[PDB]
Ligand binder design. Structure first.
Ligand code: A1EJV
Length: 277
């Protein structure tokens, strides 16, 4: 059984590693990485914190759970590698180092950033200090501005797909649903125009608006029903918005504009005085 490199522009490496012995039963992932801990898991598979056995660097490796069920299953999983290729390098985006397949399992090796914003909020156990929130909002807007300037829509912006790096910075990741101007999204963060089949970069700004609202108010977002509709009418529900500053509420209202034709872009938001460097 051979591991096959899933090639993409920007992989930084063209070759197996000297430690890989193809005559051994263990997988390339087993032979080439020291497994340190499991960062997360789900129906998609597992994400491990690893050290490369070749150069000792820290990486994050995600592997799918079950072998490819067929060509379409494989194409859907491999598309996440193509999306990383379309994103390219940016300081606020998770960099894909390399990807390969073995035994029908897909492996994605990225830079190690840290826990997801969802995990960080679970540990903090309250509304995040608003100064931390502004930094995450700005860093993810920088990421969104990079994607949107290239005609890319993330379509899955949420705390689980933002990852914290050192010194309070974060990076947008998990590009499995990214499309170049489509799969089922998370309805909690879904822009209203997506229901009517209208897809644009504006949908990411709305999703980030609800993402910031969630972490800054420690409130759980509704999957549907009347509460879902409350958040798509241009106003903020009054209970949890009490603690937000005038400036933060002001930005969130701009991001949650229901009409995508009128909704501010990532570049417009980053040019506001409140979002200055
Ligand atoms: N890079 C990190 C990832 C990660 C791993 C593999 C991928 F293909 C990715 N795409 N986008 C992000 C990722 C990561 N995944 C899950 C959890 Cl719970 C924490 C994580 N922490 C990280 O720093």
């Amino acid at each position: 059984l051979q591991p096959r490199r899933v090639s993409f522009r920007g992989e930084a490496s063209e070759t197996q590693s000297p430690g890989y012995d193809p005559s051994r039963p263990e997988s390339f992932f087993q032979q080439s990485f020291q497994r340190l801990s499991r960062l997360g898991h789900g129906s998609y598979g597992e994400v491990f914190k690893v050290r490369s056995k070749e150069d000792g660097r820290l990486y994050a490796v995600k592997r799918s759970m079950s072998p490819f069920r067929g060509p379409k299953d494989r194409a859907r999983k491999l598309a996440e590698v193509g999306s990383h290729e379309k994103v390219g390098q940016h300081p606020c985006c998770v960099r894909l180092e390399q990807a390969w397949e073995e035994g029908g399992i897909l492996y994605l090796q990225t830079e190690l950033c840290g826990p997801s914003l969802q995990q960080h909020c679970e540990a903090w156990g309250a509304s995040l200090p608003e100064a931390q929130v502004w930094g995450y909002l700005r860093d993810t807007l920088l990421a969104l501005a990079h994607l949107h300037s290239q005609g890319l829509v993330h379509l899955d912006v949420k705390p689980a797909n933002i990852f914290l790096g050192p010194r309070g910075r974060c990076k947008l990741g998990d590009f499995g649903l990214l499309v170049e101007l489509v799969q089922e999204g998370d309805p909690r963060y879904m822009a209203p125009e997506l229901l009517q089949g209208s897809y644009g970069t504006a949908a990411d700004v709305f999703s980030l608006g609800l993402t910031i609202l969630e972490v800054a108010c420690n409130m759980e977002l509704p999957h549907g029903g009347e509460g879902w509709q409350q958040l798509r009418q241009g106003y903020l529900p009054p209970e949890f918005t009490a603690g937000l500053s005038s400036e933060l509420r002001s930005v969130l209202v701009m991001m949650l504009e229901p009409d995508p034709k009128l909704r501010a872009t990532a570049e417009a938001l980053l040019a506001l005085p409140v979002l200055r460097q």
